[PDB]
Amino acid sequence: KKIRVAINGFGRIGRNFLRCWHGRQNTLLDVVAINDSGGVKQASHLLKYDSTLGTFAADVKIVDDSHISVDGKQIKIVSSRDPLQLPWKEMNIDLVIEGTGVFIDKVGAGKHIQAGASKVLITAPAKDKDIPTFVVGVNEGDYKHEYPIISNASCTTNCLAPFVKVLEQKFGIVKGTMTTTHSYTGDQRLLDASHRDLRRARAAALNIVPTTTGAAKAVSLVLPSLKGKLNGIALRVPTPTVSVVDLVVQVEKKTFAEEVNAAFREAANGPMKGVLHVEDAPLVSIDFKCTDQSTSIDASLTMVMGDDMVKVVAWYDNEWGYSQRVVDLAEVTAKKWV
């Protein structure tokens, strides 16, 4: 028995979620609605043509001023900047995908429940500790149907947590730091312009732009043994999608690169299959575009210095790979629904 879904914010994340879900062979989700500010004309066009994903093979059409069609499946399009006006009760909306990035606290996110929706799934870190956070392949087992509002974490935390988990079990972690060399996002300005963060203000395709990240501390939400053990930053570089995590950890049990790669390979062929991948080919960022996995370990880059300083480089598609996790977590809510 499938569950009825609404997508709030038809952005990079909302559209990637639709194409991720649409391409699944078997699903318990049925997307019926999309709150989109630009109406049917925007939602239908940007859904069909995409500068990073490419052209959607499915058939996209505008049925009328309130609806679009994907391969004949009708979808209601609504438009309210204020979520309280959204028709969640009338359309019997079980689950919302909150991809706007504005309604990420419990007050704002609750409005979708208030407008009659049964559950909310934040496509980002929540802004309060009261909202439970999950990473598929790490702690999705701990999700309970009683949780009305859930967080699927950051794209970077989705890359970091699965391989951090393996390191923690196999070698044990004392402390560490990370750098995400991350593709530019819609938050950065195209040319130098207004922004509360004076780095993110600078022309994105011209510059290496340092920015703060919560992925290093956020890992502790899904892996309690990591509490206070990691910090880090990000460097936004002029690529439109695909990112890489550079992790330096001090480990308890002295090791070597081949032993650290064997641990990742055990996890990849076993319990983290589909989430963690170990790549042995000497590839580049574009080769990781549209990968389904959360993290791809660059095997040849793994480096151990002085027996216990371990460096791991992990590729992730921050749009698509994260979207394939958002479809996974939503499926867990569908599988658990009362």
Next chain:
Amino acid sequence: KIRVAINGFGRIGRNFLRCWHGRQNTLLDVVAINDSGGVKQASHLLKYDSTLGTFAADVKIVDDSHISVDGKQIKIVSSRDPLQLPWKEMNIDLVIEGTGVFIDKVGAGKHIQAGASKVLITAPAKDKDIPTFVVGVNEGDYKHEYPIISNASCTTNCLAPFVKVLEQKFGIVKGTMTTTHSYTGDQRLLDASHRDLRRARAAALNIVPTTTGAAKAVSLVLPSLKGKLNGIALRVPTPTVSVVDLVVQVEKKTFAEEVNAAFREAANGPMKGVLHVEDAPLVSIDFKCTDQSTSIDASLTMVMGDDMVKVVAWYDNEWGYSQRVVDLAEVTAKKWV
């Protein structure tokens, strides 16, 4: 002499301050800047520029509402509503409208309600009755009696001066143009919401066709050209400098060397500093921070079938346009009261 206010401290407002600050002789005294970001944003973005490079000038935050450039202070007002702005109080003669939001008599009009005597719009006027000027083409028809004026678009400022030579020397039957244009702030960094589904597309990944009023707009500064020119823009992945590609059927049969000589006459005399003729085989980045409106690529000038003229002209859409903005505002200074 005249006391200038800058509304909207974006690429054109910040280009205007650096251009004006670089004039040896200036009749303009920039006293106020309206920026939402406050002294801390304005000081930072004036000083660090991804395109322009670091301002050589000493820029500091004096207090909560003032910055100094080489010790000269400027007030930072912060209202999205022009009607609020204290220009009666600050005795503001002229206002530079770099917001792109107040483009009509009513929108532009609000600055004058607030005390300013005149408005200079760094963009085409939305309203017909607003006179538009291109320095080196029709700035002579400028009059103090005009309270709200337009400095046209960056593309129109590149096109109008060379079109002017062509119409004088050969005469124009009709013509079409393409501007291969550097991306701008209108465009989205990644595919996102936009009225223009083309401008919605990732700016740094694409050649993005878009509309241009620049061809028809030439008829505003050269009335002889009404209904003769049309064109499009191809926005491409460069942060500044753009190039106009014009194809015109002309009345007087001609050849490449003869067209270039006509441009060179104008370059050396009446349009010096507005029109340049470039002989070296350069690329867009070499036209960065050029003060001229138009740089004819002399070797690209082509004539086919005697009367079909193709001209390729470079322009820094930020810096060259901004130098013309400084020039139009200076003209209102020399014609003031």
Next chain:
Amino acid sequence: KKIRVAINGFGRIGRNFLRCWHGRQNTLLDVVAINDSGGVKQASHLLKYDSTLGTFAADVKIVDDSHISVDGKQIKIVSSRDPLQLPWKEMNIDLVIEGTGVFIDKVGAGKHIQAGASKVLITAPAKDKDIPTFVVGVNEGDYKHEYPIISNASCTTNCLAPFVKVLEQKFGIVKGTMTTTHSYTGDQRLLDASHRDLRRARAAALNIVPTTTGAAKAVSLVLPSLKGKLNGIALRVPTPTVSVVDLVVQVEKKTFAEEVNAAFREAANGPMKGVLHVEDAPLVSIDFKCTDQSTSIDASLTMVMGDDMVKVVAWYDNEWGYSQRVVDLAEVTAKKWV
């Protein structure tokens, strides 16, 4: 009865030719060899992973120091900078695809015949008038098996000639000029460096770089009525693939945009089906990536000024669309072979 093919120069064109051909449902070609300077390791890697085409779905493997495998089909890899040493006689090589761009005159190209090859197919304009030039959908009918050496023209001439043909038949052309706003190529330098052309010397991804083009005069080789009627230039901009032709022609019969688009639509639905396309969606360069057609008319951009000045904007994928023509022309030689 299929013909045996060798690819000389496993560059952007050689590799695009292999993937174009490999993806054809029915073909009379059987690629058996590739002269590649970088040996099996280069040819196998760059064939599998591609920054513009993306990852090849087929199975690519190195069988030994002289061979690679594509989906189990074995291919001999050789390496001679000097074509005279190539094993064309011993491998019974009927047809060579000359994609090096160095052996494009009749003396250099003949060396592949001299080394025992039966025919040569230059992936570029030939440097002498003695080598016949063909454009599929315009003049491929005039190709004769007796022609040992053939030219498939430039990517730009492949975009220009099909739509120029329609204009010439329907309205008749007096004179015109073109601009190709073209993606950067391997000929341009990444950073400012040595080049005989001081424009092409300048950093390609930083600049709009003017360059000479023979596509405007080259059109007269396939459409003799165009002789001396067109000239033009190119502007190389910082995109890695996909280009656009901006054509301004003076026509005899006075017309309007909708009439000019109707002519292109008649050709597209009729005799130029698969080569000429009319696009009504407001798209951008990336949307034309990996298109099979030689030319896609941007319908909404078509413009007529003063009754007889006509402007047409035509998108073309200079790598893939051109490669789908190179596979087409090679098929015509296979279909005509004695």
Next chain:
Amino acid sequence: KIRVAINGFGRIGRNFLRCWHGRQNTLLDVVAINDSGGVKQASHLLKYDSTLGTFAADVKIVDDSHISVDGKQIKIVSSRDPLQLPWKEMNIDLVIEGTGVFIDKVGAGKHIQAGASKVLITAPAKDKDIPTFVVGVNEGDYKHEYPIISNASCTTNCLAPFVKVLEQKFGIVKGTMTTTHSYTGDQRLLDASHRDLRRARAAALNIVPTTTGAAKAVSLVLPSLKGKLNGIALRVPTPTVSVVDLVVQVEKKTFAEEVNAAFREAANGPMKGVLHVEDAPLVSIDFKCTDQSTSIDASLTMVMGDDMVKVVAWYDNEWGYSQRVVDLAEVTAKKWV
């Protein structure tokens, strides 16, 4: 005073001429340039630069084998073989090896066979016995008796000075580094032939992991660091400026403010002009055309678990490295004979 020859007029050779030409006081006199492109290529690429911008200097072609910069002539020899070069005839004291092709005693040695007394390699030495120097770290150990010397790599020049402070003040146990590096000439514009299958990939489209000797190379100028440091490079789509990300376990437990103060001590005194400490929140392009080797991003300095130090340092891999090349060559001038 000393008569300098530049072999290989690429990004480093052209950066060297502009850097040297900008020194108020110089003991160097650049008399000859070996460029395959001839006076017409050298004059053009010295004058027009996609990164550096237009040379303010007057550059002209005097004749078939000479260019003038601000009237000073330079001879343009054109031989791929250094053994051919007429440096006995031109009385060439020092040769700047910017080709990247003659990196060993034998390859570098050919310039001296041809008449030159000394060779300065703008890259790591292929041969062990060739001494390498980093200005602000170990240039004091420089001696005239060394006929062939190395100025190390751009990354090593960024790393070595701040590593030096860390080893003095806190001491280094072991450490790893990543340099997020601007693309270079080694890399291909579109996927094409390369020994390094990663460097084969389109430079402006990708984050491209590559090897670096920069971590181990620090042990050449700081012998205390042997076997303590390793690293990689991520080449990214920017034309210049790069940033070193170093994580080191140190002996003396410490905190962010204490590490930054140690860098600031070095910046204000012994490493002034080699090491800078930046407090403003800048981006890579703001570090363009900086003369310093290293720019510490003060706010990014992080200390985790008391003894794991992360430092983020900017460097213009072209211009800052080139200013160090000018500095090493100057040192051979002040120690000459």
